Amino acid sequence: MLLPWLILIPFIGGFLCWQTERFGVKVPRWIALITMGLTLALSLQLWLQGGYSLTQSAGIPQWQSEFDMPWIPRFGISIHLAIDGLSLLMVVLTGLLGVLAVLCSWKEIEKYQGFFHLNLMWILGGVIGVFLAIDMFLFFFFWEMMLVPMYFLIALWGHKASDGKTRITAATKFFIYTQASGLVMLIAILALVFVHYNATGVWTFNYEELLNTPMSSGVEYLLMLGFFIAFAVKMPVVPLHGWLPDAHSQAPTAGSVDLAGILLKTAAYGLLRFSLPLFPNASAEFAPIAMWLGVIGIFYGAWMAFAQTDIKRLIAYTSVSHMGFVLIAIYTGSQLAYQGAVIQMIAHGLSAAGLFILCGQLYERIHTRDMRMMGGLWSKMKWLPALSLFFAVATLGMPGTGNFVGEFMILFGSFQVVPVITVISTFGLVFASVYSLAMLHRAYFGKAKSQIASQELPGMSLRELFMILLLVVLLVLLGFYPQPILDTSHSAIGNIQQWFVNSV
Amino acid sequence: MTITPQNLIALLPLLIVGLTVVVVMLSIAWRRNHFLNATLSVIGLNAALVSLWFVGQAGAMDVTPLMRVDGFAMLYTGLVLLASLATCTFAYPWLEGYNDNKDEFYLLVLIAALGGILLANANHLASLFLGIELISLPLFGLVGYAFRQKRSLEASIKYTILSAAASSFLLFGMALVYAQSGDLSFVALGKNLGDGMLNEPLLLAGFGLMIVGLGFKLSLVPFHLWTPDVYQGAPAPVSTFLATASKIAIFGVVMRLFLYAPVGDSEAIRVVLAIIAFASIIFGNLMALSQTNIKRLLGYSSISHLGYLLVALIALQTGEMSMEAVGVYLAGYLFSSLGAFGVVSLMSSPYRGPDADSLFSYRGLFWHRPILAAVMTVMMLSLAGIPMTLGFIGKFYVLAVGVQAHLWWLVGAVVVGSAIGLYYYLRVAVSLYLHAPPSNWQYSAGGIVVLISALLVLVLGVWPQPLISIVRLAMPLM
Amino acid sequence: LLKRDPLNSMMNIPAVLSRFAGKGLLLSENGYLRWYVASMSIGAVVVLALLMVLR
Amino acid sequence: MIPLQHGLILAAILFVLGLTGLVIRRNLLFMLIGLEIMINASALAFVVAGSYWGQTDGQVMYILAISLAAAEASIGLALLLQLHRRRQNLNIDSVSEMRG
Ligand SMILES: CCCCCCCCCCCCCCCCCC(=O)OC[C@H](COP(=O)(O)OCCN)OC(=O)CCCCCCCCCCCCCCCCC
Ligand SMILES: CCCCCCCCCCCCCCCCCC(=O)OC[C@H](COP(=O)(O)OCCN)OC(=O)CCCCCCCCCCCCCCCCC
Ligand SMILES: CCCCCCCCCCCCCCCCCC(=O)OC[C@H](COP(=O)(O)OCCN)OC(=O)CCCCCCCCCCCCCCCCC
Ligand SMILES: CCCCCCCCCCCCCCCCCC(=O)OC[C@H](COP(=O)(O)OCCN)OC(=O)CCCCCCCCCCCCCCCCC
Ligand SMILES: CCCCCCCCCCCCCCCCCCCC
Ligand SMILES: CCCCCCCCCCCCCC
Numbered sequence A: 001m002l003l004p005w006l007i008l009i010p011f012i013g014g015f016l017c018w019q020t021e022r023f024g025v026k027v028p029r030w031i032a033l034i035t036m037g038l039t040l041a042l043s044l045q046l047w048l049q050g051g052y053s054l055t056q057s058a059g060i061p062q063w064q065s066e067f068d069m070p071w072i073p074r075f076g077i078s079i080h081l082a083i084d085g086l087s088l089l090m091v092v093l094t095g096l097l098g099v100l101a102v103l104c105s106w107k108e109i110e111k112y113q114g115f116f117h118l119n120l121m122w123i124l125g126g127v128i129g130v131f132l133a134i135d136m137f138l139f140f141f142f143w144e145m146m147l148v149p150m151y152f153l154i155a156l157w158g159h160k161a162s163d164g165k166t167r168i169t170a171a172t173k174f175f176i177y178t179q180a181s182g183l184v185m186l187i188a189i190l191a192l193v194f195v196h197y198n199a200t201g202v203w204t205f206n207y208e209e210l211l212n213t214p215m216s217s218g219v220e221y222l223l224m225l226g227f228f229i230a231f232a233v234k235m236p237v238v239p240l241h242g243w244l245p246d247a248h249s250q251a252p253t254a255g256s257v258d259l260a261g262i263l264l265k266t267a268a269y270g271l272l273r274f275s276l277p278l279f280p281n282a283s284a285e286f287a288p289i290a291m292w293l294g295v296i297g298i299f300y301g302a303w304m305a306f307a308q309t310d311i312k313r314l315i316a317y318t319s320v321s322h323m324g325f326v327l328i329a330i331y332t333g334s335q336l337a338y339q340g341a342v343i344q345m346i347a348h349g350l351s352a353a354g355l356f357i358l359c360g361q362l363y364e365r366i367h368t369r370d371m372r373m374m375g376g377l378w379s380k381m382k383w384l385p386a387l388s389l390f391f392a393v394a395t396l397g398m399p400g401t402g403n404f405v406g407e408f409m410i411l412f413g414s415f416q417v418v419p420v421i422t423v424i425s426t427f428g429l430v431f432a433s434v435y436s437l438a439m440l441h442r443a444y445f446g447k448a449k450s451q452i453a454s455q456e457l458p459g460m461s462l463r464e465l466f467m468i469l470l471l472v473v474l475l476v477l478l479g480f481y482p483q484p485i486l487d488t489s490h491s492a493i494g495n496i497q498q499w500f501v502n503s504v
Numbered sequence B: 001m002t003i004t005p006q007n008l009i010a011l012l013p014l015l016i017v018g019l020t021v022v023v024v025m026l027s028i029a030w031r032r033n034h035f036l037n038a039t040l041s042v043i044g045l046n047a048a049l050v051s052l053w054f055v056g057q058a059g060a061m062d063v064t065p066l067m068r069v070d071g072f073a074m075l076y077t078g079l080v081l082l083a084s085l086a087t088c089t090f091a092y093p094w095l096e097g098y099n100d101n102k103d104e105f106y107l108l109v110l111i112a113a114l115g116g117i118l119l120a121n122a123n124h125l126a127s128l129f130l131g132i133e134l135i136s137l138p139l140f141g142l143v144g145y146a147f148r149q150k151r152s153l154e155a156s157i158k159y160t161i162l163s164a165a166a167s168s169f170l171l172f173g174m175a176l177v178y179a180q181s182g183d184l185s186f187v188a189l190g191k192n193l194g195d196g197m198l199n200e201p202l203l204l205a206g207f208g209l210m211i212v213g214l215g216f217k218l219s220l221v222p223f224h225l226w227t228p229d230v231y232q233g234a235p236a237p238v239s240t241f242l243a244t245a246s247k248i249a250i251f252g253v254v255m256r257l258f259l260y261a262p263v264g265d266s267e268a269i270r271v272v273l274a275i276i277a278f279a280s281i282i283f284g285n286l287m288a289l290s291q292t293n294i295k296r297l298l299g300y301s302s303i304s305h306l307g308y309l310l311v312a313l314i315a316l317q318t319g320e321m322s323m324e325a326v327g328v329y330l331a332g333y334l335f336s337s338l339g340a341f342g343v344v345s346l347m348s349s350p351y352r353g354p355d356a357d358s359l360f361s362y363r364g365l366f367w368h369r370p371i372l373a374a375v376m377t378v379m380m381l382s383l384a385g386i387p388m389t390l391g392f393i394g395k396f397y398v399l400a401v402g403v404q405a406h407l408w409w410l411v412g413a414v415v416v417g418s419a420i421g422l423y424y425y426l427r428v429a430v431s432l433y434l435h436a437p438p439s440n441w442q443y444s445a446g447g448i449v450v451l452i453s454a455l456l457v458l459v460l461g462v463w464p465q466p467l468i469s470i471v472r473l474a475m476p477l478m
Numbered sequence C: 001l002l003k004r005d006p007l008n009s010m011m012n013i014p015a016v017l018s019r020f021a022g023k024g025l026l027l028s029e030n031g032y033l034r035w036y037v038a039s040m041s042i043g044a045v046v047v048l049a050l051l052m053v054l055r
Numbered sequence D: 001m002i003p004l005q006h007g008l009i010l011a012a013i014l015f016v017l018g019l020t021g022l023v024i025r026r027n028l029l030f031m032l033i034g035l036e037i038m039i040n041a042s043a044l045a046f047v048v049a050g051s052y053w054g055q056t057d058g059q060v061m062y063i064l065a066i067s068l069a070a071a072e073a074s075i076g077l078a079l080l081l082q083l084h085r086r087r088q089n090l091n092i093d094s095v096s097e098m099r100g
Helices: A003-023 A028-050 A085-104 A113-132 A136-145 A148-157 A164-199 A219-234 A243-249 A256-261 A266-278 A280-307 A311-330 A335-366 A384-395 A402-417 A419-443 A462-480 A483-502 B005-010 B012-030 B034-058 B071-095 B103-121 B125-143 B150-181 B201-217 B227-233 B236-260 B267-287 B294-314 B322-347 B370-383 B390-404 B408-431 B441-462 B465-473 C006-028 C033-053 D004-024 D028-053 D057-087
Strands: A065-072 A077-083 B061-063 B067-069
Touching: A003 A028, A003 A065, A003 A077, A003 A113, A028 A085, A028 A113, A065 B465, A077 A085, A077 A113, A077 A136, A085 A113, A085 A256, A085 A266, A085 A335, A085 A462, A085 A483, A113 A136, A113 A148, A113 A256, A113 A266, A136 A164, A136 A266, A148 A164, A148 A256, A148 B408, A164 A219, A164 A243, A164 B390, A164 B408, A219 A266, A219 A280, A243 A311, A256 A335, A266 A280, A266 A311, A266 A335, A266 A483, A280 A311, A280 A419, A280 A483, A311 A335, A311 A402, A311 A419, A335 A384, A335 A402, A335 A462, A335 A483, A384 A402, A384 A419, A384 A462, A402 A419, A402 A462, B005 B012, B005 B034, B005 B061, B012 B034, B012 B103, B034 B071, B034 B103, B067 B071, B067 B103, B071 B103, B071 B236, B071 B322, B071 B441, B071 B465, B103 B125, B103 B236, B125 B150, B125 B201, B125 B236, B125 D057, B150 B201, B150 B227, B150 C033, B150 D004, B150 D028, B150 D057, B201 B236, B201 B267, B201 C033, B227 B236, B227 B294, B236 B294, B236 B322, B267 B294, B267 B408, B267 C006, B267 C033, B294 B322, B294 B390, B294 B408, B322 B370, B322 B390, B322 B441, B322 B465, B370 B390, B370 B408, B370 B441, B390 B408, B390 B441, C033 D004, D004 D028, D028 D057
Parallel strands: none
Antiparallel strands: A065 A077, B061 B067
C-alpha cells in the first residue's frame, strides 16, 4: 500500500522541484531534499514494520507487501508492486543514495536547476519502480523510463570542462546500449507471455503466473539470453561495458548522476529476481559461460582501472570488476554466495558513492582529473586524501568494511560450488589491491607533478564532510556488523535459491 | 447495388466533404477571402468528423459494390479528417505570407481528404484506384503551391512524374488481376481458385504491380527514393498532410485489401512483403543517421515507420491482433508526425521564401520557443519508441504481433532499426536544447494543436487503454 | 596493451558498420528523377521475379 | 476468337515501351508522353480484360483511367510550362538540387 507512494513521492517531488523554481533559485534543492528524505523515511518505516528478520523462506512468491491496480487490462497488464527483503534493501539503498545525490548537488544554483532536480527525482523513482515491479511490462517500463532523464542529465548538465559533442556522444552511447538491450528483454518477455498464453489461454504479464510456464529447452535458453543481455548491459558484463566509463566521465561533476542511477545494481537484482526463477534450467546450463564472463570482467576491469589516467574512469572500471564478482556469485546456486552478493551490492554502492563524491570534490578543488597533473595532495588538503584512502581501502576488500564481507562470502559459497573460478577470482582480489594502491599513489602521494597540486587548497565544508563520514560509518558498520542486513535478505535469497536448485 | 437513405447516412462524411468542396469553391467565386474560405473548410471537416457519430449509429453496411462502411472505415476516416484539420490549421499562418492566391489550398486539402475518406471506405479495385488518385492529384498541387520557389517546383515535378508512373503500374496490375479473376471486388481476388492453386502466376504478377504502386505511395523500399526530396521541397503544412493523411489512408486500404482478398495469405506475397518491410526498416533508419535537414530526416523516418507497419501487415492472417496493432500504431504515428511537422510549420510561418528546415535553425530552439522545443522533443522521443509515449505502445504492438507470428527476422530488424532511430532522434531532441546564435490567434491555434498532440502522446503513452479499447471497437466485417 | 579498451572498440564495430551502410545507401538519393523512375522499374522487376520464383 | 493472352501481351508491350521512353528521355515533355503511353496501355489491358469476361467494368475502368490521364496530363503540362518559364530549359536533370 505504501509502495505506490514509494514510487510517486519522487515523481511528485521532481514536479514540485520544477514548479517551485519561481519562488527562488535556492528552493528546488530543499524540495528535492525533503522528497528524498521522505522516500528514505518511508523505506525505513517499511523496514521496521516488515519483520524481515523473523520471516522464513516459504517459497516464491512470498511478499511482505503487495499492491495491485489494473493498467492495461487488454494484455493483462497491471501496476503490480511487491516488496520483500532483497527489494527492500535495494529501495533503502536507493533512498540513501538519492539523499546523498541531492546533498552533493547543493551548491549548483544555476538558472535551470529545477529541471536538474526533476530529472534526478524521476531517475530515483524509476529505480525504485524497477526494484518494486513484479509485472514484467511494468518492470520493463521502469527499466527504460529511467534512462531518458539520465540521457538529458549527462547531455545538458554533464562535465562542463569537456566539449558538448563529447557529452552528447557519451549520453547517446549509454542510451543506445541500455535501450537496445531493454528491447531485447522486451522481446524475451513477449515470447514468454505468448508461450504462457498458448499453454493456458489467459493474458498475463504477472511474474507470479509466468513462473509456472512449461517450455522446451532451447526456447527457455533464448528467453534467458534476452533477459541476460539486458542485465549484462546494465550490470555491466564484458564486453557490454564500454558505455559505463564514458557515462561516468561525462556525468555532472558533483556526481549526483553517478549515485542516482548508476551505482544502484538493478541488473544483479534482475538476475536474482527474474532470470534465475523464470528460467532455472536455462540459467543452470548458462552458468559456466556467465561465471567465465565474470572472471574476465574481474581481471579486465582491474587492468583497465590500472591503465587509466582519469580517476572517474578508474572508479568505473573498479565497478566492472566488482560486478564480475557479483555475476560469479549469482550463478552458483549457493545461499552463502547469494547473501555475499547482496552484501557486495550494498557495500559497493556505498564505497563507489564515497569514491565518486570525493572525486567530484577533488575536481572542484584542483579543476583537473588527470592524475599526471597531481601528486603529494596529502600535504595540501585537510580531509579529502585520508577519506579517499579509506574508500580505496574499502574497494580492495579490506576487512572492517562491508566489501570484504561481501566478496569473501561470495568466494566461500563459490568454492563450495566451483573451486577453479573461485581461486582465479581471489587473484582478482590481488589485482584490486594493485589498482587501489596505484590510484592512491598517483593522486595523493609523492611530489606535485604540476602547479595546481603545489598550493594549499580549501578544505571540505561541513555538508560534504557529513555525507562522506556518514558513508564511512555505514561501511564500517556493515563490515563489523552485517547481521541485520543478512537477516533482512535471508528469506528472499532463500526462496530464490530453493527455486533455482529444486527445479534443476 | 442501389443507394438507400441508410446508405446515405453511411455516406455522411464523404457527402459533407464534397459539399464543403462545392461551397468553398463557390465562395471563392464570390470573393477571395482567406479567413472565410479557411473557416468554411475547417467547418466542413469538423462537420464530417462529428457526423462520424451518426455513421456509427447507422451501423456497418455495403454502400454500392464500391464501398463498405464499418468501424475500420470510421477510424481511418477520423484519422484522415484529423490530419486534414491540422493541415488547414498549420496552413493559415503559412499562407498569411503568401502573395499569390491562398484560397485554392483549402480546396485542394478538402479534395485530398475526400480521397482519404474514399480509401477508408474502399471495398473495390475501382474505389481503391480512385481514392489513390483523389489523394495524389491535389497533393500535386499542394506540393508545388509555392511553385516560384525552385525546391517546391522540383518536388512537385518529382512527385507528379513518379506518382503517375506508380498509378500506371497499379492500374496495369489491377487489369491483370481482373483478367485472372473476373471481378474487381476485394473478396473475389483469388476466390475462383481452389485445391492449393492460389499462386496463379497472372494474379501474383498483377498483385506485384499493385505492390509497386502502393509501395511507392507508402515510401516502401525500393520505391522510396522520392520521399526526402518531396518532403523537403513541399510547404511544411503540405509535408504534414503528406506524412500523415496520405500514408494512413493508403495503408488502411492496403490493410483491407490484404484482409479481404483470398490471395492475401499467399506465401510468395508474404515473403516479398517481408523482404520489403525488412529493407524499409533498415534502409529508412540507416539513411537518417547523418541528416542535417529535419524534413528529409522525417522522410527517412516515415520510410522506417511504414516498414514497422508492414511488419504488422505480414502477420494479418497468422495472428489475431494485427489490425488492432495497425490502428494503435497509426493513431500514435499520426499524433507524433502532426506534432513534429507542425512545429516545423510554425517555425516556417509566415511564408517568406526558403523553408526553415536546417537543424542549425532548430539548434537552441528552447531559448526562444520553449513550448515548441518541448513538443518537438516529445515527438522525437515518440518516434523513437521511447516509453511514456504512444510511439512505444505502437512499437510494442508491432513487436508482439511479430513475436506471435514467429517473424524473427522482422523482429530483429525492428530492434536494430530502433537502435539506429534512437541515435538520430536523440541527436535532434538534444540539439534542441543547445546554444546557437506570430501574434495572431491562428498561429496560437497551430501551437495549441501541436501542444495537444504532445499531451495526447504523453498521456496515451502512460495510459494506452482508452486508445486500445477504441481501436478494438473499430473492427471491420469479418 | 589493454589501455585502449579493445572490447569497447569491438562492440563499437556495429556503429561504424551502420555509418558506412548509411553513407552507401545515401548515394541512391542523388536527386535525379530519371534514376528514381529507373529504381521503381528495377524494384518492379525484382518484385515480379521474386513472385514468379516462389509461386 | 481473340485470345485474352494476346491482348494482354500487346498491352504489356505498350506499357514497357512507355516505361522505356520515360526512363531514357531527359526532356520532360517526352517523360509526360511516356507516362501517357503507360496509362493508355494499362487502360487497354483493362478493356481487354473486360471484353474477355463480357462485362462493362473494363470500360468503366477505362473511363476512370482516361479521366486520370487527362487530369494528370493537364497538371504535368502546367508544371512543364512553369519549368520552361523559370528555367528556359526542359532538361529534367537540372531539377536535382535536393539530394542526400
Ligand atoms: C551481446 C551482443 C548481442 C546483444 C546486443 C544487444 C544490444 C545492446 C548492447 C550493444 C549495443 C551496441 C551499440 C554500439 C554503438 C553505440 C552507440 C555509439 O557509439 O554512438 C556514438 C556514435 C556517434 O559518435 P561518433 O563516434 O562521434 O560519430 C560521429 C560520426 N560523424 O553513434 C553512431 O555512430 C551511430 C550509432 C547508431 C546505432 C548503433 C548501431 C546499432 C545496431 C544494432 C544493435 C543491436 C545489437 C547488434 C549486435 C551487436 C554485436 C553482437
Ligand atoms: C537484434 C536483437 C534481437 C535479436 C533478434 C530477434 C529475436 C530472434 C529470436 C529467434 C528465435 C528462433 C526460434 C526458432 C524456433 C521457432 C519454431 C519452433 O520451434 O516453435 C516452437 C514454439 C511454438 O510451439 P509451442 O507449442 O509453443 O511449443 C512449446 C515450446 N515452448 O515456439 C515458441 O514457443 C516460441 C519460441 C520463441 C523463442 C524466443 C525468441 C526471443 C528470445 C529473446 C531474444 C533472442 C535472444 C537474445 C538475443 C540474441 C543476440 C542478439
Ligand atoms: C548492421 C549490422 C550489425 C547489427 C546487426 C547484427 C546482427 C543482429 C542479430 C543477432 C542475433 C542472430 C540470431 C540469434 C538467435 C538464433 C536462434 C536460433 O538459431 O535458434 C535455433 C534454436 C531454436 O530452439 P529449438 O531447437 O527450436 O528448441 C526446441 C527444441 N528443444 O535454438 C536452440 O536450439 C538453442 C540455441 C542457443 C543459442 C542461440 C543464440 C546464440 C547467440 C550468440 C551470442 C550470445 C552468446 C551467449 C552470451 C554471451 C555474452 C553476452
Ligand atoms: C470546434 C469544433 C470541434 C468539434 C469536435 C472535434 C473533435 C471531436 C470529434 C468527435 C468525433 C466522434 C466520433 C464518434 C464515433 C463513434 C460513434 C459511436 O457511437 O460509435 C459506436 C459504435 C459501436 O457502438 P454501437 O452504437 O452499439 O454500434 C451499433 C452499430 N453496429 O462504434 C463503432 O461502430 C466504431 C467506433 C470507433 C470508430 C473510430 C472512432 C472515431 C474516429 C477517431 C479518430 C481518432 C482515434 C485516435 C485518438 C483517440 C483518443 C482517445
Ligand atoms: C542499507 C545501508 C546499510 C548500511 C550498513 C548497516 C549495517 C548494520 C548496522 C546495524 C547497527 C550496528 C550497531 C548497533 C548494534 C545493536 C545490537 C542490538 C542487539 C544486541
Ligand atoms: C538485422 C536484424 C537481424 C535479425 C536476425 C534474426 C535471426 C532469426 C533466425 C530465426 C531462425 C528460425 C529457425 C526455425
